[PDB]
Structure formats: structure tokens, C-alpha cells
Amino acid sequence: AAATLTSKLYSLLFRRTSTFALTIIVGVMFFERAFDQGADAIYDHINEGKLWKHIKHKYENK
Amino acid sequence: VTRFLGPRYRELVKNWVPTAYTWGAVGAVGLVWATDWRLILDWVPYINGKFK
Amino acid sequence: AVSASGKWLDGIRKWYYNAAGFNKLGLMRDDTIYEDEDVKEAIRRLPENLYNDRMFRIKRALDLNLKHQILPKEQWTKYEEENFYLEPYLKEVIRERKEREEWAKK
Amino acid sequence: TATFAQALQFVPETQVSLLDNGLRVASEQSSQPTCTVGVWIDVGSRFETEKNNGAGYFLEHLAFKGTKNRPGSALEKEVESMGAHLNAYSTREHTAYYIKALSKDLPKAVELLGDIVQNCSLEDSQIEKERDVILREMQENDASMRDVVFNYLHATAFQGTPLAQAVEGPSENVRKLSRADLTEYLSTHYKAPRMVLAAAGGVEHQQLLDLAQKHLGGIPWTYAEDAVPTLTPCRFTGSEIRHRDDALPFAHVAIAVEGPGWASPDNVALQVANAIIGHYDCTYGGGVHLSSPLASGAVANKLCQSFQTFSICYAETGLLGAHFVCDRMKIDDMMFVLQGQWMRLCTSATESEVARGKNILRNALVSHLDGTTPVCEDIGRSLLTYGRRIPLAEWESRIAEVDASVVREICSKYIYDQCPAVAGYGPIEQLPDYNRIRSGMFWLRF
Amino acid sequence: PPQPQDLEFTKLPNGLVIASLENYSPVSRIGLFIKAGSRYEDFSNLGTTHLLRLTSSLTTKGASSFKITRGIEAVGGKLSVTATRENMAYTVECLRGDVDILMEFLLNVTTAPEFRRWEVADLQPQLKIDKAVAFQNPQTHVIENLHAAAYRNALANPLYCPDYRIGKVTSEELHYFVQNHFTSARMALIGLGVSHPVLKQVAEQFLNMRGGLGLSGAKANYRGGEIREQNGDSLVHAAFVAESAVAGSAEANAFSVLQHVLGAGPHVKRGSNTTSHLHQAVAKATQQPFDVSAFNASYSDSGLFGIYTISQATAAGDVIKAAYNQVKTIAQGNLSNTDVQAAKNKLKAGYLMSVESSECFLEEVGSQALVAGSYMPPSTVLQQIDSVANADIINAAKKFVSGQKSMAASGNLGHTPFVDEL
Amino acid sequence: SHTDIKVPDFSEYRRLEVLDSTKSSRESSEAR
Numbered sequence A: 001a002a003a004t005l006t007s008k009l010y011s012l013l014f015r016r017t018s019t020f021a022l023t024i025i026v027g028v029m030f031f032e033r034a035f036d037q038g039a040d041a042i043y044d045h046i047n048e049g050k051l052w053k054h055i056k057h058k059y060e061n062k
Numbered sequence B: 001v002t003r004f005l006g007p008r009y010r011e012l013v014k015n016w017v018p019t020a021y022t023w024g025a026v027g028a029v030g031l032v033w034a035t036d037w038r039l040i041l042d043w044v045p046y047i048n049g050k051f052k
Numbered sequence C: 001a002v003s004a005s006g007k008w009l010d011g012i013r014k015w016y017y018n019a020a021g022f023n024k025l026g027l028m029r030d031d032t033i034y035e036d037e038d039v040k041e042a043i044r045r046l047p048e049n050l051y052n053d054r055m056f057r058i059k060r061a062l063d064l065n066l067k068h069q070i071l072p073k074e075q076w077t078k079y080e081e082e083n084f085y086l087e088p089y090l091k092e093v094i095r096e097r098k099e100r101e102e103w104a105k106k
Numbered sequence D: 001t002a003t004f005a006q007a008l009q010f011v012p013e014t015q016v017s018l019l020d021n022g023l024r025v026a027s028e029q030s031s032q033p034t035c036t037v038g039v040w041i042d043v044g045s046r047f048e049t050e051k052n053n054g055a056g057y058f059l060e061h062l063a064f065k066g067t068k069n070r071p072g073s074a075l076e077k078e079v080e081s082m083g084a085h086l087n088a089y090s091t092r093e094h095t096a097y098y099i100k101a102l103s104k105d106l107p108k109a110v111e112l113l114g115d116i117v118q119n120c121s122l123e124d125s126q127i128e129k130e131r132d133v134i135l136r137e138m139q140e141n142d143a144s145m146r147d148v149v150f151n152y153l154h155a156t157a158f159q160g161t162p163l164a165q166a167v168e169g170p171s172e173n174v175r176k177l178s179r180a181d182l183t184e185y186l187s188t189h190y191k192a193p194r195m196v197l198a199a200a201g202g203v204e205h206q207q208l209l210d211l212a213q214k215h216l217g218g219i220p221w222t223y224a225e226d227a228v229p230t231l232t233p234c235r236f237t238g239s240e241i242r243h244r245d246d247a248l249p250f251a252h253v254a255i256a257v258e259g260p261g262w263a264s265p266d267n268v269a270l271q272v273a274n275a276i277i278g279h280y281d282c283t284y285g286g287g288v289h290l291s292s293p294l295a296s297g298a299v300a301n302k303l304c305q306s307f308q309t310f311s312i313c314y315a316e317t318g319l320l321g322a323h324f325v326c327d328r329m330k331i332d333d334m335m336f337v338l339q340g341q342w343m344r345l346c347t348s349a350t351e352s353e354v355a356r357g358k359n360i361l362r363n364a365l366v367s368h369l370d371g372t373t374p375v376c377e378d379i380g381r382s383l384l385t386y387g388r389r390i391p392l393a394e395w396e397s398r399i400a401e402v403d404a405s406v407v408r409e410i411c412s413k414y415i416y417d418q419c420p421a422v423a424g425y426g427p428i429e430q431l432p433d434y435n436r437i438r439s440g441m442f443w444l445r446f
Numbered sequence E: 001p002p003q004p005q006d007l008e009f010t011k012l013p014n015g016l017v018i019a020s021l022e023n024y025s026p027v028s029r030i031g032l033f034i035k036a037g038s039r040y041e042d043f044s045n046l047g048t049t050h051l052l053r054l055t056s057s058l059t060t061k062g063a064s065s066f067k068i069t070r071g072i073e074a075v076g077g078k079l080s081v082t083a084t085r086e087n088m089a090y091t092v093e094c095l096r097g098d099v100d101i102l103m104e105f106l107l108n109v110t111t112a113p114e115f116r117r118w119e120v121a122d123l124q125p126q127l128k129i130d131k132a133v134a135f136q137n138p139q140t141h142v143i144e145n146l147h148a149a150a151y152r153n154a155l156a157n158p159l160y161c162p163d164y165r166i167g168k169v170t171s172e173e174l175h176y177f178v179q180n181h182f183t184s185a186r187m188a189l190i191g192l193g194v195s196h197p198v199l200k201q202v203a204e205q206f207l208n209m210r211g212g213l214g215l216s217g218a219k220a221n222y223r224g225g226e227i228r229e230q231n232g233d234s235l236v237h238a239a240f241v242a243e244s245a246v247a248g249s250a251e252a253n254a255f256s257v258l259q260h261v262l263g264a265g266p267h268v269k270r271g272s273n274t275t276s277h278l279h280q281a282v283a284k285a286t287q288q289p290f291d292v293s294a295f296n297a298s299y300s301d302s303g304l305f306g307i308y309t310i311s312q313a314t315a316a317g318d319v320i321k322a323a324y325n326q327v328k329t330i331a332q333g334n335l336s337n338t339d340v341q342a343a344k345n346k347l348k349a350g351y352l353m354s355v356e357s358s359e360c361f362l363e364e365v366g367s368q369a370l371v372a373g374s375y376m377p378p379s380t381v382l383q384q385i386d387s388v389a390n391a392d393i394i395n396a397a398k399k400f401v402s403g404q405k406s407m408a409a410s411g412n413l414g415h416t417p418f419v420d421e422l
Numbered sequence F: 001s002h003t004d005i006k007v008p009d010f011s012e013y014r015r016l017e018v019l020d021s022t023k024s025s026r027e028s029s030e031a032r
């Protein structure tokens, strides 16, 4: 229960809605990058060795 | 227009200036994010990785 | 003061007045002014007799315009008989607005 | 000839002096031929429980019904043959008995006062008479609407706290009290050093101190079994109470947010803000698009009948808000304008409004103190609230420190994005739901 | 601080009385007292005064309505218009440093009023609101009926506009009343924080205004009629007045002592007035809630002494009989000495306690200046009040008993007596 | 008689930080 952490977040970035919107924009930018990278890694893991990315090395520059 | 002048209308602008800057910043970042503008984005420490 | 220029000014103003057709319909000058909020309040301050006269003359003008007719020559409004009945009221209302705006800025 | 702050220095000061038992004696002398002597006690409904909720109010009814030395009608006969006026009042945090009389009768007044606070006879037949009297007076209070909505506001804003219950107490409680709970309440609370004697007007401090020792010096200061009635803080709750009765003429909303205790500097600035909003009525002259912003808009569609802003302060906590009446069909519009005015103060406050607020505050402070009785009340309430009597010069100095920026920060500290407490008693079908009221405490543009 | 100052009086050749005092309070107060009142209207114009006192905020030739309110509001001061059948009192309060500003408005409003007809028309509906609020309390309706029941012409005029005149008051009537009743000789000016010499020159401006004397009224004649109302309220009100002495006379003091002997005013809160003779007489007559006391209204032309009794509809007759019988016993000569002293002490305490407040003190000074122009210190009041003898009070009681009575009673009236049978 | 009204207990709905009728709510409002 990081009550102090939530208190700091509110007092600095939520009391005014202008700051509230700005945090949202930066958060989504970072979130999409992390979400996309993690999801693609999971997809590649489940399908290891079948995607063309995993076999192109056997023909590219070859 | 002449009525808009006066000591207080200047004060009202001063109070709202911080809010105007923040809203302008919100719009600028939103535009860059929506458009995936590589020119500015290439100087972002982590987001730049997306670009290959 | 200038006499010849003043008489020329009076003559050209009379010519312009005759060029404007509202005298042809029995309308006074103050009836044609655009009715903004200031004019609306000014009309609200008119005495009953002037207000009643103003409404009837407007009705007659609208009725004449309905049938594309013109009032007889003898009944046209004359440049020298006109009374600016609405001027004092409109001036007072405008001055009050200026005072309010001047206070509002400081 | 004299400037404002220069005239403030000609006001006489108050002389304080303790007795052995711990009683505080204060006095402000003048050339007037009259005086007001009273005792203030730091006892109220805040110190009571469910079993003795109405004890303070009940005792007030028996205060002047007779005493051991002057039984029955002897007490009022002496008071009235003197031409004086005997009065009392109660609250959730204070009680007071004060007499207005001529300086020539200062001695006797104190004697009686001491007799009333030490030797209060509690004959049982009198208790029965007061039972019915309080029962009827409670019915009258129901007729008053403002009292009803202000008690509701306390009940909902201090849920589960001793500050929630009213001074009078439940009707069921007043019909079961006995001469044993009243004596326990009297013995446990009415004693020095909680008492504060005050005397403003043509009275000399020296005389006021010898007389007090003669009579008030006998009050005990030791609790039995060390059963000390300790005070505790009070929690504030953001909630609403809606009592609907469409037969009543007008809606009667009341809103308030939590506010500082009486002993914080910020309250002064808040008072200035309350002066900007101001009060309105239907009998005031002019003002239609000619007075403060909330009252100018109050007559454009004929929204309100009368609204007032209040700031109730208790120890460690208080209430800050605005009370308004309105027609059935215009409830939401009046609330909309009021919330806009509060938010405007939090964000856009000009110095011209502040200067008007400061001037209004100075007038209220100076004009209120006119007369002896208001002066004596201020001495007693201050000595039990701050422990001192803030002089006018200090008040002016603190007010001068107020600035538009200061008001913005303080109002943002207490008004912005805070959960309010709402009370409505009347035709209140149009009152907006709490969620809408709570969403109107901030701005999406800010 | 300096020594206690005194009040300076002066009378300009116009006839205006100017009085000033120099205290050291930080708040200053100015007042204008005019002999104009509701008694100076005739049947042609009525309700004029009631509308006139609402026009204090209207525009003037030298200042706009917008300016007056905004200027006063910004300074933080106030302006009020107290009114009565005999007099009208303008009053203004502010700080020491702003006096010169506010006086400019006060002078203007009473010297150069410009009763714009459209402004008057828009202000007309306010009359109903004011009238309704006052009548919310039934005591207002009972007295205004009482004055209309005991006087034929002059003091019968109501303080509030009659219903039928609400929409028909004109600016010409306002103008006509002002010219004929705002004369300088009829006026007086009082100041508390201001210095006397500056008061002279600020007042010098209107010496070119008004002047001479105004339109005199008519001596109020006494009739003795009744005015019953028969409303649906459960608690009946009444009134039993008779001719009294004139304001500011030796006989008037005896009547003042008489009412306080009869328990006119309550002193102790939540307590029965045992010393009051009327409450004792009624307590053994009714066992339900009741309220009783004496009435005293002294005017320049005449006065009226009487009794007011709130009581239940069923017990109205008994209450009135007990009160009236009590007065007869007093008139018969049964009056103890102790009651005289107790009543006198009540009077002196009331007088000094009332004047204690600065606002009331300014009101008392203005009222005295108009009629006489010479302030009479409270000590002189005490010597006058102590000269009253028992025989004087007995004579006062006998006069009230023998005199003709006027009665106004609102309520159910199912059991209330009539005059000629009381 | 209106003094006989009192709010029923909400203890089963209140949040943890406001469950005590003695602790002030100002120290948790910003956190909540």
C-alpha cells in the first residue's frame, strides 16, 4: 500500500487536468512500444522456427 | 477593439499562461505520436528503437 | 464659420435625403436604424405616444412595400420637418454601456 | 486627522489575571456608564454522549429557575428590580451566561452570576415543566427550515462523531433524563480553569478581580477518580442527505466542504474569499447587474431568493460553504453558478476583487464590535479559542498580507477537487445527483 | 488618546441645523434627517413615501445609479433609509478616509434626484415584495390598522402603499413631494467621525438648493373607531389604545413610567415576568399560551397609550377583561412605591442601554435636533424622569380609563369583545 | 423532532483509511 506514492502522483500530475492529459500521452507512447515489443516476442516464441524471419538467414546473401 | 485592454485583462492572461503552455505541449506531443514523425522521434532514447 | 461650404453641405445632405426613399413611405430617419440590443432598450424607454406612432408608420411602410406602391407626393416626409425623437434615448444608453465597459477593465 | 491603522492604536487593551483555582479574568475598560459581565464555559454537545445529549440545553432551561440562596422567583425579582438583562446561549462547543447592567451594580451582578454557576437547584417538579417546554420548542424548530438543514449538514458531515448530534438532542432522550445525570454533567464539566469571566464597558480590572475572588474563588479544579473528559478529533465525511417534501414552498439546499480549525492563519484568507462571493436577498436595493458577480447573476433569470456564505470553525476542524434558497424549477442553475464562482476564485482572482473583500472585512470587524455585549462575547470566545484576544492592529496586519496569489493557493488547497457535503430539505427533485455535484468541483479546461 | 470631545451645534441662516462630534473610532457615520413622513401625504397621493425610500439607489443628475452602488460597494460602506410617520432618515457608514467620497453621493441623492420614469416603472413591482415581507409578521398589520382606526386624516396614513396604488405611482408625484418637503429648514445633518469645520463646507454646496419652509400638514384628529379583520389564524391579536400626551411633555413621562409598571418589556429570558402586573392578572385567567404588555406611541401632535394581547381565540375575552380590570385598580389609587422605583430603574437602564450603540445614538441625536435643535444630555433625562410623582401616574391612568378607545383586532374573533362592551 | 434523524452506519462500505471515526480524512484523501 504505497499511499505515499499515490499521494505524490496526485499532488504533482493529477490535480490539474492539463498535466493529467500530458501524462496520458507520454504513457501511451511508452506503453505501445513496450506492449508491441513484448507481444511480438511472445508470438515469435510460440512459433519458433516457422516464421520466415527465422529461416530467411538460410537464403539471404546465400 | 479597445475594451479588452486594462490592468486586469493582462493579469487574466498571466494566470492562464501556464495552462496554455501545457495544452500546447499536449497537442504537440499528441500530433507527433499520432503521425509517427520520425524526424523528432529519432531523438527519443527508447521510442527510437521502433524505427527497424 | 464657413457659409458657402456650409450651404453646400446642407444642399448635398438634402439631396442625399431625397435620394433615400424612406421619405417616400412616410418614415422618419430614426425608424430605419438597425435594431440592436441598445436600440431595443431605447425603444423600451419611449413614451406610449411616440411608440404607438412608430409602430403604425412601420406598418404602413410594410403594407406599401407589399403592393410595390408609393405614398402620394404631398404626404412624403420633408427634410426640415423631421424630429430626431430617438436620439436622446439612444445616446444615454450608449453612454451607460461605455461607463460599464470602462469600469469593467479596472 | 487619524489614519485607519492610527485609530486602531487608541483602542484600550484587555487585562488578564488568573486566580489560584485557575480561573481567567479579563476586562476592557471604557467611559461608558454600563457594562456586560458574563461567564464563558468550554462545554457543549461535543462533550456529550447518547445518554446525555440534551443535558446542556436542558440545564440552560433551569439556569434561572432558582438557587439555594435565592429560591424560586427570588433570582429574577432581584435581576428585574435592578433594570438589568439576563441572557444565555449554548452551542456545540461553548456555553455562556451574561448580564447587561449599569456599572453602579457591578458587585451584585457577579454575586448572582457565581450563585447561578455553583448552586443551581434542580427541583424535580421544575424538571417536568421543562420536559414539556423543550418538547414544544422542538416542534417550533421543525417549522424553521434553516435550522433543519444546518442540523442535517452536521449529521451527514460528521457521521459517527460527537459533533454530528444537535445541541437539543433527540426527543426520546429528553423524556428520560433524571436529577442524577444532570448533577453528574454539572459536576464533571462546570469548573475552573475552563470558566472565563469577562466584563467589558465601564468596569475596572482591579474591582473585577477582588469580586471574583470573593465569589468565584471557591470553584473546585480537581476531578473525582481522575475521570477527565478528554477531547478527540472529528472525522469529516463527504455525503448527502435528501429529505423530500413537495408541499413546502421553496427548495432549501445547503453545501459545505471541510475547512481549517479556528486556530490556523488560512481562515483569514478564506474569509476574504467569502466576501467576494457575498450574500444576497430579495429586499436589497438595486444590485440587478450592479453588484457582486454571484448576486448580479442572481437577478438575470430571478434564480435565488437569498443566499449566504458561511465559515463555521471548531477546534481542529470546521465547515466552509454556501447556503442558498431557490425555486423548485431553478435548483440546478443556482448550483451551477455557485460552483463556477468558487472555481473562478481558485484559478482567476484579480486584486480589485481582493481589495473589495479586504475593505468589507475591515468594516465587518470594526462595525461588529460596536456595543458592549459584542465586545464581551469576543473576549470570552477568544480566551477559550486562542488563549488570547487578537487586537485590531494585528488583524489589520494579517489582512494586509492577503494577495490575489495567496487567495488562489488557499482556495485551491481547500475547495478544488474536494468531496463536498450536501443537505437538501424541500422540493428537491431537480437537485443534481452527487456524482454531478462532485464533478463540478473541478474544471476540465484548467 | 485625547480628552472626551463634545458635540458642536450650529444653525445656518437657511435654518438648517448642523451637529458634529469628534470621537476617535476608525469607522465614520453620517446621517440626514428630514421632517418628511407618511403624515404629510393627502388623499391625492398615497404610498409616495413608501416608494420614495426605495429610490435611494436611483440615478441623479450628478451621479449615475451604476456609479453610486459600485463606489459604495467597493469602499465597503452602507446606505440605509429609516422611515416613520413623522420623519425620514438617510444614513451612511464607511471608514475615516472615505468620508469625502460617500458624502458626495449622499448629498446628491437628496439634492438632485432625477426620477427617471422608466426606472420608476421597473421599480414598481418591488413594492409588493417589500409589503409582503413586512406583513409576514402579523404585528405590522395590526398597528397599521390601529393608526387607521384612531386617527381621521394625518397619522392614519399607512407606512406602506395601498394595494390599488402599487402600479399607479408616478414620477411627477415623487418630484412634487420632494420640492415641497425637502426644504432646508426641515432638515438636519449629523456626523460622528467627521470634524465640524469640514462638515460646514461640504454642506455649503446645497445652500443653493431648497430653502425656506415647506408644505405644512394637518393636526391629527381622533375618531375612536374599530377595525376588525377576521383572518383564519388561530392566535388572535388585538389592541386597546386611548388618547395620550404629546411627545416631549411632562405628561408623556408619566405614561412612559405607567407602561413599565405594567410589565411592558421582558427582561429575563425563558422566565415568567412575576413583577409584571399584567402577566400576573392573566396567569390566573388562562392556562394556555398568552402574551401581554403595554403600548406607548408619542408623536409631535398627539400620543396613544394602550395594551396589546396575544392569546387563544377562546380566551381572548377573558385576557382583555383581566388587563383592563388591572388598569382600573391602578387608576383607583392602588399603587405601591416600590413599583415606581423599579419601573424608573427599568426606564433609565433601557434609555442608556439603547443609546449605548453608536447607531442608536446618532438616531436619537437626529430626532432631537429636528424638533428643538438643542441636544439634551442623558443626565438631564434622568432628572426629568425622577421628577415623576405618584399622583401624576394616577392622573394618567384615570385619563386612559375615561378616554375614548380605538381597537384593531386580527384573528378568528369568534369570542373577542367589541368596543362599547369592553 | 428532526433532531431524531441520524445517518445509518456505512462501515461495511467505507474504505480502510476512513474506517475510524477519530482519524482525520485529510491525510488520505489525496492518496485515495
Ligand SMILES: CCCCCCCCCCCCCCCCC[C@@H](O)O[C@H](CO[C@H](O)CCCCCCCCCCCCCCC)COP(=O)(O)OCC[N+](C)(C)C
Pocket: A014, A015, A016, A017, A020, A021, A024, A025, B027, B030, B031, B034, D417, D442, D444
Ligand atoms: C475514434 C474512435 C474511438 C472509439 C472509442 C471506443 C471506446 C470503447 C470503450 C469505451 C471506454 C469508456 C471509458 C473510457 C474513459 C474511462 C475514464 C473516463 O470515463 O473518465 C473521464 C475522463 O476524463 C478525462 O480524463 C478528462 C481529461 C481529458 C484527457 C484527454 C486525453 C486525450 C488523449 C489523446 C489526445 C490525442 C490528440 C491528437 C492530436 C492530433 C473523467 O475522469 P475523472 O477522473 O472524473 O477526471 C478528473 C479530472 N482530474 C483528474 C483533473 C481531477
